[PDB]
Design a protein around this ligand. Structure first.
Ligand code: MG
Ligand code: MG
Length: 195
């Protein structure tokens, strides 16, 4: 195999991982995020859900991740919350904060389906890459991480496809989920600086 096929080092977030599984805690956390951002700021977005199917559709969203800086990421374990946090809902529906990710449009649906929350102002990293990189490629979060960072995303299938609704989350689940939203934040940031 070519050099381009070599196994690269794993992208691993090493900043602060804030784990929340209580509604009001999550809403106040959402306000902290809003107090630390200005209109236009972008955050890495992503979510997880259990394996088993539910009445003909993917298991209901159990975790939502938001990476707000290069040193901090939030894990909102909604599957363990009595009600969906109002401050998070408002945060996610606030067009003042952009959410970056890959396959994000699909997250919007399902988000609407599972929680009746309308994700507002989301950016599909694939479109941003093709724009700033002056190309027309079919990106994945992994291929973007490889191309721009020289790393690959953690890939233990048993972790990535684990029971995300199982409480509490394991340190591995927390690292995987956190890093995925982190990639989203770093990829957007780097792509945006280009000109
Ligand atoms: Mg995902
Ligand atoms: Mg993920």
């Amino acid at each position: 195999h070519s050099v381009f096929e070599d196994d690269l080092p794993f992208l691993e977030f090493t900043g602060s991982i804030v784990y929340s599984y209580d509604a009001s805690d999550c809403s106040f956390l959402s306000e902290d995020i809003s107090m630390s951002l200005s209109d236009g700021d972008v955050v890495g977005f992503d979510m997880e859900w259990p394996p088993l199917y539910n009445r003909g559709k993917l298991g209901k969203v159990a975790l939502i991740q938001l990476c707000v800086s290069e040193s901090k990421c939030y894990l909102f374990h909604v599957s363990s919350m009595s009600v969906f946090p109002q401050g998070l809902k408002m945060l996610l529906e606030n067009k003042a904060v952009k959410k970056a990710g890959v396959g994000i449009e699909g997250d919007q649906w399902k988000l609407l389906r599972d929680f009746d929350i309308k994700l507002k102002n989301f950016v599909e990293l694939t479109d941003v890459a093709n724009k700033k990189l002056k190309c027309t490629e079919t990106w994945s979060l992994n291929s973007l991480v490889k191309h721009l960072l020289g790393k690959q995303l953690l890939k233990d299938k048993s972790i990535r496809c684990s029971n995300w609704s199982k409480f509490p989350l394991t340190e591995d689940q927390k690292l995987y989920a956190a890093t995925d939203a982190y990639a989203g934040f770093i990829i957007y940031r780097n792509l945006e600086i280009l000109d």
